[PDB]
Amino acid sequence: MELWLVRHGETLWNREGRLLGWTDLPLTAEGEAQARRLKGALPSLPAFSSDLLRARRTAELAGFSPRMYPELREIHFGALEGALWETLDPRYKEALLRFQGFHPPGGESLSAFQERVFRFLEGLKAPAVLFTHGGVVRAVLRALGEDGLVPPGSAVAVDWPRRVLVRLAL
């Protein structure tokens, strides 16, 4: 199934290297500019979006009218929400880089997070555009044997659950 995964535009914490999960931060002005540049560049397929403001806003500025689904949320960081990556305990930093053995205090385990993400993808019947988060895009790309680091406000199309089709960044 052709799926477009769109990472929302820049937020202040995305700039400052701070963990951003369920904290409902808004897009910065450049984040909004990135979202607007997606309008007309993405296929006009039905859209779905995380219910977090930054994702909803990105969908809107991109010219879409998404349905809101919590399953598309970034992973909840719990007590690590907003945590400065610089002072993050190396134990967490390493687990985040490897994308394994990570369960932030009071947040979601990486296993529960990826299960709800992939479960959601399994429920799609036709190609669609998913406005979501970096963690979600990374989970999908990694499962497909590619690294899932993409820039904010960019998109990647995949032929789930087989391979990646194209990476769109502008």
Q: What does the block give as tokens for 52?
A: 């977090």
How far is Cα 73 from Cα 110, in angstroms, rounded to an integer?
Answer: 13
Q: Is the peptide bond before 127 cis (omega within 30 degrees of 0)?
A: no
* Residue of 8, 60, 81, 108 marked active site: 8
Range of the domain at 161: 1-170
Q: How many beta carbons lie within 10 A of that of residue 39, not counting itself?
A: 12
Q: How far apart are CA 109 and CA 76, in angstroms?
A: 8
* CB-count exposure of residue 75 (10 Å: 0-12, 13-18, 19+): buried
**How many domains is the chain partitioned into structurally?**
1
C-alpha–C-alpha distance, residues 47 and 52, integer Å: 15
Known catalytic residue: 76?
no
Which residue among 32, 74, 81, 108 is the active-site one?
A: 74
For 1, residues 6+ apart whose C-beta sits below 8 A from its C-beta are 121, 124, 126, 127, 159, 160, 161
Q: Is the dihedral of CA 153, 97, 95, 137 positive or negative?
A: positive
The token pair that represents 2 in the structure block = 């052709």
CA distances in angstroms from 96 to 89, 103, 110, listed in the order given: 11, 9, 9
Burial (Cβ within 10 Å: 0-12, 13-18, ≥19) of residue 139: buried
Annotated catalytic residue 103: no
Helix (H, G, I), strand (E, B) or coil at 149: coil
Q: For the stretch 19-37, what's the b/e string if a residue is b when 16 or more beta carbons lie within 10 angstroms of its beta carbon?
A: bbbbbebebbeebbebbbe
Q: What technique was this entry resolved by? A: X-ray
Q: What is the CATH number of the domain that holds 6?
A: 3.40.50.1240
Two tokens, residue 136: 């979600």
8 A C-beta contact, residue 68 and residue 131? no
* Binding-site entries for substrate: 7-14, 54
Cβ atoms 128, 3 nearer than 8 A: yes
Q: What is the DSSP string of 127-147?
A: -EEEEE-HHHHHHHHHHTTS-
Which residues are annotated as part of the binding site? Answer: 7-14, 54
DSSP string, 17-63: TB--SSS-PPB-HHHHHHHHHTTTTS----EEE-SSHHHHHHHHHTT
Residue recorded with tokens 């019947």: 125
Residue 66, H or E segment: none
